C-alpha cells in the first residue's frame, strides 16, 4: 500500500490524475518526484521551473553545482539530486524537446530512466512546453516503465483527453 489518493488506474503498474504536481509532491512526500529536465538543468519555466520555484529556488542552487562538476545531461538521461521539500529524490528525466528538433524515439530512452525506481511520482515526458503529443507520450510511458509510476496531468481537459482516448 501507498499514500497516492485519487488516481485511475490505466495498467497493473501505471496511475494517473488531474493534479498540481508542486501540490501533490508538498502532500504525499514521495520518494522521488521527476522533473521534466532539460539537459543544462536550467528550470526556468514549464515542470522544471514550477517545481524549482515550490523549492524556493534551492533545486537551481543545485543543479548549478551539479552542472559545474559534470557537465550537460544528454536527451534521454537523467541524475538524481535532492528532492528538496517536495519528495526524498528528484529524478531529473530530459525527454526531447518537439520545439528544439530532438529525435522523439528518445522518448522511451527518457522513460527508461523511471525503472531505476521502485514508485515514481511524475508528469508526461515530453508534453507541454517540450511540445510532443502527451497521448504519444501516456502510450511510451504504459509500453517502457515496468515499476509504479504515478502520473499527474497539470490540464483537466487534457486529463479527460487521455483518459478517454487510452488504448
Ligand atoms: C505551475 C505549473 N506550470 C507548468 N508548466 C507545469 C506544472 C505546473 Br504545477
Request: glycine fraction near 8%.
Amino acid at each position: 500500500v501507498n499514500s497516492f489518493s485519487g488516481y485511475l488506474k490505466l495498467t497493473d503498474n501505471v496511475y494517473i490524475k488531474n493534479a498540481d504536481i508542486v501540490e501533490e509532491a508538498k502532500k504525499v512526500k514521495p520518494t522521488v518526484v521527476v522533473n521534466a529536465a532539460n539537459v543544462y538543468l536550467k528550470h526556468g519555466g514549464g515542470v522544471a521551473g514550477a517545481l524549482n520555484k515550490a523549492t524556493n529556488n534551492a533545486m537551481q542552487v543545485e543543479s548549478d553545482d551539479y552542472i559545474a562538476t559534470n557537465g550537460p545531461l544528454k536527451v534521454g538521461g537523467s541524475c538524481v539530486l535532492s528532492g528538496h521539500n517536495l519528495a526524498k529524490h528528484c529524478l531529473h528525466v530530459v525527454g526531447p524537446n518537439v520545439n528544439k528538433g530532438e529525435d522523439i524515439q528518445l522518448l522511451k530512452s527518457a522513460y527508461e530512466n523511471f525503472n531505476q525506481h521502485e514508485v515514481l511520482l511524475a508528469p508526461l515526458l515530453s508534453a507541454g512546453i517540450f511540445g510532443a503529443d502527451p497521448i504519444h507520450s501516456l502510450r511510451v510511458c504504459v509500453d517502457t516503465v515496468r515499476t509504479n509510476v504515478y502520473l499527474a496531468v497539470f490540464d483537466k481537459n487534457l486529463y479527460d483527453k487521455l483518459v478517454s482516448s487510452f488504448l
